[PDB]
Amino acid sequence: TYATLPANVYRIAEAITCTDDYIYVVARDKVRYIKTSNALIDFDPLSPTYSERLFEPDTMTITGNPKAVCYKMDSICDKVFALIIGEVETLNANPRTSKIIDSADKGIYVLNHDEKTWKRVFGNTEEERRRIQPGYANMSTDGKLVSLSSSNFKFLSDNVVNDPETAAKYQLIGAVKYEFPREWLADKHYHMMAFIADETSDWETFTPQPMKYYAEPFFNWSKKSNTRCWINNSDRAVVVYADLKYTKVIENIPETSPDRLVHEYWDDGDCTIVMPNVKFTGFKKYASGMLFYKA
């Protein structure tokens, strides 16, 4: 698509979402429904309207906080999230790129559709809400991951309890021992965690899970080619190429036209089918079995 904005989000842009049916863009906690293909357009001389399809008219503007400075947003299948940090800077309007502070209502925000309203399932409490920081947080999603991101783990409440046994063998009258609530945390430097949650649920209450690549949440997701890119703070750019099976798919041509090697004959019955001598090199696993023909 082209042009820009409902004209409320003009300039002042924040993140993106493709989904499948239609695009999403956000600013000041706003939205746009722009259809990926075959949206509405007319040249009636209001606005340039050059046959650059204009956006759906309405907007949602989640919760009650204007200029809420939603952070990066991403989508898989048909669903979105749109993490918001907090803040709004505490003063209405103004740019959302300066002096971010901590405010209520921060969360991932879902947006289960057909209601044009966003559910916000992650932070329901300061416990879960504090885990998001204005700095160093991202929603980035490898296919069926939606990792969120975090740091700043702190033993809270039930993380310390009881300890009767330490009172034994001593006089201490009381003690506090940790419960070690299990949250996978990275080694190396700037220890990082992840809230990754997938399927099994309908997303819906992220829970801590091992982060595969060490700041998977900082990668820029891509769907076509299904690879993820990012930049190492060393100024190098890292690529994760995802995966493949070794299926060759030998001789794919429709029945029409020459140059197709594999085809079936008949003579008074008596099938005869011919193939090129399939071969390939390079597969680095020592594993063997069929070449295993399939359609």
Binding site: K154, F155, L156, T166, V176, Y178, E183, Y190
Partner: protein, 334 residues
């Protein structure tokens, strides 16, 4: 392995315990290679329902990153430990004090101080002279630990309580080469000098300071050498001969450096760590990085979890009210 055909014997001696310590302090310095140290302060959370009391105690920390991570969450500010503040110590036995259980005695190899006080004061233009240690107990009267008794059983056995008092335990700077033996027995071996200025500052009710080499080798006659012919035997330095084998460093926490935090009600709950070689905020993450040289960094600007945490502790309240400085003493045997 166990019960091998060959059986070997290895002492590891004392000096390795000390010499290993020296290498620790021998690079604290300024630069990329010298890995400076930083102490750090604590938690704001009431830590429990029973918090302020005598019984009960903070939960035992954990070396795992799950425990490493909560500090940088719960921590406020880091004072820095200069190279000059860390110091090597000795239990400071002194003859003549009535407060400490045994007035004189001081069996076999022990460190004494005198001229530090009303009771032991002698010949004072030099302040504390006294780190000298006892070379031999006095003659007989030792009834030692087992049945046997006589000047023999120190060899097959334990230590001598000489049962006789000492008198005139002050001494000169010392005899030429080997040192003085003023009274009956109780030969004394003179160990360095300890000027008064460093005393009132870097000593304490417990322990005492010994200079490091690179000081004495640099400057005799302040710490007072050139009397010692055994010096040129093994270069200057002597932290070994004292058998120091322990290191403590301290830090001044002044509520002025942390004006935030220090408000009417700050409860400074436990957590007081130590750490090594942190780093600056970096501004935006892509950049070069710098070693952190400026005192009393705030918790923010430290690159959360920069450097490695070398120590942990939990002291349940403390106080940390404004205008009251805080002095932390921590003692390692490394």
């Amino acid at each position: 392995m166990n019960d091998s055909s060959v059986i070997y014997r290895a002492i590891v001696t004392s000096k390795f315990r000390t010499e290993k310590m020296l290498n620790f302090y021998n690079s604290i310095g300024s630069g990329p290679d010298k890995n400076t140290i930083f102490i750090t302060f604590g938690r704001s959370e009431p830590w429990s329902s029973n918090e302020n009391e005598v019984g009960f105690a903070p939960p035992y920390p954990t070396d795992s990153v799950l425990g490493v991570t909560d500090m940088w969450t719960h921590m406020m500010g880091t004072v820095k430990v200069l190279p000059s503040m860390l110091d090597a110590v000795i239990p400071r036995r002194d003859w003549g004090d009535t407060r400490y259980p045994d007035p004189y005695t001081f069996r076999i190899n022990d460190i004494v101080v005198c001229n530090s006080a009303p009771y032991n004061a002698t010949e004072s233009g030099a302040g504390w002279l006294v780190y000298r240690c006892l070379d031999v107990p006095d003659t007989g009267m030792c009834s030692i630990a087992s049945l046997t008794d006589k000047d023999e059983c120190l060899k097959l056995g334990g230590k001598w309580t000489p049962s006789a008092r000492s008198m005139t335990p002050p001494e000169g700077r010392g005899d030429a080469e080997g040192t003085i033996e003023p009274g009956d027995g109780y030969v004394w071996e003179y160990l360095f000098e300890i000027p008064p200025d460093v005393s009132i500052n870097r000593c304490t009710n417990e322990y005492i300071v010994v200079p490091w080499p690179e000081e004495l080798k640099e400057d005799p006659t302040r710490w007072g050498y050139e009397d010692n012919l055994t010096w040129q035997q093994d270069d200057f330095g002597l932290i070994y001969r004292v058998k120091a084998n322990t290191i403590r460093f301290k830090a001044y926490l002044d509520s002025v450096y942390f004006p935030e935090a220090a408000l009417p009600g700050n409860k400074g709950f436990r957590q007081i760590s130590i750490i090594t070689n942190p780093l600056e905020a970096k501004a935006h993450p892509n950049d070069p990085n710098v070693k952190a040289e400026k005192d009393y960094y705030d918790p923010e600007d430290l690159m959360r979890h920069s450097g490695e945490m070398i120590y942990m502790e939990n002291r349940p309240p403390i106080i940390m009210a404004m205008d009251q400085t805080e002095e932390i003493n921590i003692l390692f045997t490394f």
